[model samples]
Target: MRVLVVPLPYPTHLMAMVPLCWALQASGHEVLIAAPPELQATAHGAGLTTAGIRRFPNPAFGQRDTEAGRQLWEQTASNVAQSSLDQLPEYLRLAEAWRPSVLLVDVCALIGRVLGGLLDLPVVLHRWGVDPTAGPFSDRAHELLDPVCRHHGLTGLPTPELILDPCPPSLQASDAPQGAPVQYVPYNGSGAFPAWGAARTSARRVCICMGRMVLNATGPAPLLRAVAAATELPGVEAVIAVPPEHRALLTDLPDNARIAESVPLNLFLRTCELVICAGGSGTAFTATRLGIPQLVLPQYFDQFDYARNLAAAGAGICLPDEQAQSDHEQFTDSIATVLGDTGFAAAAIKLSDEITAMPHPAALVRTLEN
Candidate 1:
């Protein structure tokens, strides 16, 4: 079968979609990816057939440093909203050239429902991480992604054929909108998690993964301070996977703290007893599914909601903003407690095993194909 996969433009978004494409190709299907021109190397590195999808030349935001970034997110979202219908041409053109048997697209692309309807193709909508029922924002957040509405010559409303949530059922609301079975795809990047699982002998290992870029509200300093504070604890080592931009930010590292920039998360999460990260949906769920407890300091509104949801599901714990900001000692200590406690560790481990026990991504792709 020919499958066309479109990933969100950023690395986090791209990585989120990688596992499904990998599964499809492994199943003897042809998989092609459409993403920003800049991500061609990323796509090629992952061994997926690639095409450049859209040309924004320069997004209005993303130019600023971490302290002053993502001003363009609202603008960028608006652009997606205004150009919603206009994206159909790109999709139709790709469909014409590739003649894909099925189309899988990023939910943020805003084309899943429309193209599925017109082309009569099964549409698989993938989200990196977001709670769709947090509030009105969840329902309307799609507006920021809507570009096919402008030219699809439809009423600009989309009802997807299926939604593939990478989050486990425990972490997601049981009453979420029904389409097809909401499948959970593990973050098996580089086969890192499963591999690390075998070699992990550490009684306690703490992993820290930050957001993909500095675009979100998560700053590097607090995490740096928290890690520094954490190292002083008894027998606990702080292992962090930082982005390149923040490599220099954590200078004068401590004895028990090691900084790993952009190592495969699947590998890193598996080794760690717990993961401390900004509460992005995918990372939080990824950690939980791997039986690793999480310390989430949410940076954005959606992340805040996700953090809460994960906490409610008993998958992990969320660090309050005040505690995260004001009490590095408390934050560090809380993480230390979760790591050191055997019961908490067992609970976390069970959650991970539960997610792993579910229908794997390969089966989901086959179901979509059939």
Candidate 2:
């Protein structure tokens, strides 16, 4: 069967779906990631076949917890949906040329939902984490997309055939829509870790991942501040994992802190005692599956859910909003507590067990196919 995958044009969103794409291919299904050019580089880097659609400029957004920020994001989503609707001819052209049998769409990709309706393809939604917004966002997206639906002789947004969720059951929010469980597989783009980079020492190692989108939006302040605070702690080495662009921003790092060179979280996180991140699903789930306690500084959106859920489970701590995220002394205290306590590690290991017990992507492939 031919599978056309459509993901939001972001590394975290696409990386969350990449493992399933690998599973589909390994199980002998043809898979093509059809997304905007913003995602094509990531797809190609992941070694997947891709067809680039129209480019969509991402609106710069920083951490905010305001009505205006919420409205801005809403406006952005509508604009993105309209952009896709405007390019229906292009999506239709690709669908006609490729004629995919199934459409595997990311929950954030309204374009995929619209395209699914345009061709009447069986829609399977792939969720990144304890996403509280995917379902509600669908309602808003459908509202914006329906007029275009009429233009294409359809009634409204196409309903999904199945929804695949990757968050571990124990870590999932109570309100998150129930879906077929698929093990969260972490795949930050691959890069070589120098032998020297992984050198063992008496110091406990903590991975710091501010997340690409967060770093791109907010610049190096949070990360630099984190590095300073983390390195100040005795017997702890801070390993910063960020895109090269952000890595270049750091100068004069403390001897206790080192910037990792493009190493995937799945590879390096196993060596850490705990992980500190921006509460992105990729970082959170990767750390969870590895049994590493987390200190989540949730920036925005469903990240708060990730933080709240993980903290509720005793595997992590959450600084839920911009104010919490900006409190320097609180950030330091949270990190110290998460590290000093053994209970967090125990809970994280338990979550790891649950993740290990969940159905693998290959198994989900079989389920979806049959």
Candidate 3:
């Protein structure tokens, strides 16, 4: 079988779909990852065959802090939706030429439905994390893509033949769209495991993973503050991962806190008793699957929504904007509370075990093949 996997240009979006691409290859199927020109390097790094879409106007080209620039952030979302509509022809051309037996697309990519209908291929909605489409955005995506479908002579956008959900039920939204659950095997692209990661330590390990989007929006000060605050807690060892651009902003680090350009998050999460992040769906769910309690310092997008859900599950705490801005003690105390309480760890473990019970990605290939 041949599979064409299309993910959005962002690194996190591209990374989330990688495990499935590997699974298909392992099953003796040919796989090609089709992404925007900007993301070709990311796909190639994963050791998968690659294709590229013509560059289109970037809607969310830069970043915005939702807490501060709420309107700009909202405009980014609208821009992304509108831009996806504009790129339909380019996406269609790539799909038509690649001619895979099936189409696996990022749920956020609105062009997938139109291509699936025009090309008459089985479409699979590959979730980046929990389905964000279940609530307000579900119909809105269809409404945006309706004209593209009509242009292709379809009555409406085509529904996915299957939805590949990486999130387990415990962490998934109650109102999320229905789909086949696949075990999420965390893949943070190819990277060497840090020697520090292998050494055993008595101190409780806490990892802070801030995606490029978040750091670009808020700058490095907030994350620097998070590192400083987390390390101040007694007997906590902190491992902070950020992109190279933001690394220089961190200085005068305490011996307890170590900063790295990038490390394999999955390997690092194994040693983490707790995680602090900007609430990206990939990191949030990855931490949940590893059974590590989290502190979500969300700034924008679905991070706010996912953080609330994480808190409701008792596996983590989401710091409010007021607290995140003015009260470092509140942030510090929230971490201390989860660390002091066994319930949070126990809840996280329960979700982790539930995720382990889901079918492996390889097992789901047969369903796609059929």
Please tell me which predicted candidate would have the highest lDDT against the true structure: 2
Clashing pairs in 3: none
lDDT of each residue in 1-370, candidate 1, tens digit only: 7878766566666667777788888888998887667678678767777877771112112222232223434444555555555676887887888888777877666555566657777777776655343223234545543434545555545566677766655655444554343334544344233334346555466777765553234455556656765676677777777667777777776665667766666666667777877766556767776677777766553566566666775656776565454576777677777766766667777766766676777777667776
Q: For each candidate, what TM-score against the reference? A: 0.80, 0.91, 0.89
Question: lDDT at 294 for candidate 3?
Answer: 89
Whichever of 1 and 3 has more TM-score, that candidate is 3
lDDT for 64 in candidate 3 is 29
Candidate achieving the largest TM-score: 2
Instruction: Tell me the tens digit of each residue's lDDT in model 3 across 1-370.
Output: 7788877778777788788788889889988887777788888888877776771111121122233334444444456568777887777777667678888888877567667887788899888775545434555556666766788788877778988888777666566678898988877756778877775489988888877777787767558768877888999888888878878877777787888676778867777788888777777778888888888877755566667678888888987464464477887888799879989988888888888899988888888887
Q: Cα lDDT of all candidates, in order?
A: 0.63, 0.79, 0.75
Q: Clash number for model 1? A: 16
lDDT of 2 by residue, 162-267 (tens): 8898988776766567889998877878788655445456788888888778877766766876777687777888888877778777788777677886787777
lDDT of candidate 2 at residue 186, scale 0 to 100? 72
Which runs of model 2 end up more than 4 angstroms from their true locations? Answer: 55-73, 134-136, 150-155, 193-200
Ten-residue segment with the worst summed lDDT in candidate 1? Answer: 55-64
Q: Which of the two, 2 or 3, has more lDDT?
A: 2
